Amino acid sequence: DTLCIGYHANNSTDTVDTVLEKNVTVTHSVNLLEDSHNGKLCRLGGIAPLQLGKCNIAGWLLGNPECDLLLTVSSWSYIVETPNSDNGTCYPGDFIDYEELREQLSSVSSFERFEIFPKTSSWPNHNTNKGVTAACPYAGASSFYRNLLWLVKKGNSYPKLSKSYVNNKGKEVLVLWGVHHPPTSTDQQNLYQNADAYVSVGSSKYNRRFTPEIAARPKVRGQAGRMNYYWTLLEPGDTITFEATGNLVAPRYAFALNRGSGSGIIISNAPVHDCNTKCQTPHGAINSSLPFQNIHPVTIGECPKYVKSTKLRMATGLRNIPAR
């Protein structure tokens, strides 16, 4: 009669590495690295992402004519830009503190767009219909940004304008505007009469003055002139005042922002899809319990810690010695 003491073994092929030996077959192990995604852009918190498509944040906020599709969107789980998001500022110029605005939008889950300065009633003494350009076309015809209003002189007169807005939206209000710069003093006069105009913008915390900078610059989209874009976040209860004797591209629509942490902007060519997830990456959604993933470092929602690893298997059983 005999009694032996031994240990388990099986047909497992699982392998793990150790300090002293590589490729050791084990009886049981757990993979800690997630490496699969559905290659689709899904919704988080049951809300679809905002697909800017051919437009970029600039084109969206300013209202580039090629972004009308986005006009009715006002809430999203995250913003998506693509490798072909080129429609931004159709009229050549500098967008001041643009990256900063993008950073700001990263914590905005939605807004209430409103006509801060109604077009048909806010400018009794200035023309509001000739503000179009071939640089910002729509349906082949000259047009302009949907959220700004290019004001020009009325009957050879551009009186000092003064327009203010008091914020009672109970939240931050994003106000955008522009300053135009004709290529010649002749154009400066055709558009605004006043040779030496200025634009002035101010609130309790914002204060800035702008001067036309007349000069011909290399043409871009047919324009030798330039148009600079500005923005500011007006606080609840504060007031913003615009004063100008020419060159002001006035705000038309503005946005009352709703903050809602846990969001951002991502660049992806992955297709949006009727689907849900708790974790989203530029390549597609992850659906896993594993502590790690090597899909992508950029992530949105509840996800596994990104890591450059190719393999991360932890041994649970023992060395497998079937000796068959």
């Binding site: 009669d1 032996c4 073994a9 590495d17 902007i265 992530t299 949105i300 509840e302 000796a323």
Partner: protein
């Protein structure tokens, strides 16, 4: 093996044993077969389970982490930001692989230690009533029947 048991003085494993990681074979008159040692196997399962959970606990969840843009005159901070992302990325990849690499060694040694102890336990139970053949087998002197084998397993046996 660090403890000389697994893949050591007990050369191989039993594909036959299928109720645990550690067990006995036994070849009595009444018959043969295999039997797993719950006491052992369970304490091991608990320990390993607690180990894997402890590892996962130490690693944090990745929440919303998106890039940032920089204009043409912010190359220095663009790089600083890049140096920070790669920086922590390399740190955590290091931590994850190194932790797993080191614990795999510890886990295997753990099993080796368990087999070893199960043996020594059984050994000091039988004492003179059997001899050490090798390969972790004990050849009895006083013909051990089925209920006799069982007594060795549950550590009751008891017989000077």
């Amino acid at each position: 093996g660090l403890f000389g048991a697994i893949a050591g003085f007990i050369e191989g494993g039993w594909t036959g044993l299928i109720d645990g990681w550690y067990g006995y074979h036994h070849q009595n008159e009444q018959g043969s077969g295999y039997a797993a040692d719950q006491k052992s196997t369970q304490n091991a399962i608990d320990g390993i389970t607690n180990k894997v959970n402890s590892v996962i606990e130490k690693m944090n969840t990745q929440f919303t982490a998106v890039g940032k843009e920089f204009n043409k005159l912010e190359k220095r901070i663009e790089n600083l930001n890049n140096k920070v992302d790669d920086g922590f990325l390399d740190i955590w990849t290091y931590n994850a692989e190194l932790l797993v690499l080191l614990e795999n060694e510890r886990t295997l040694d753990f099993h080796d230690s368990n087999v070893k102890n199960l043996y020594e336990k059984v050994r000091s139970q039988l004492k003179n009533n059997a001899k050490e053949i090798g390969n972790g087998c004990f050849e009895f002197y006083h013909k051990c029947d089925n209920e006799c084998m069982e007594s060795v397993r549950n550590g009751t046996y008891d017989y000077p």
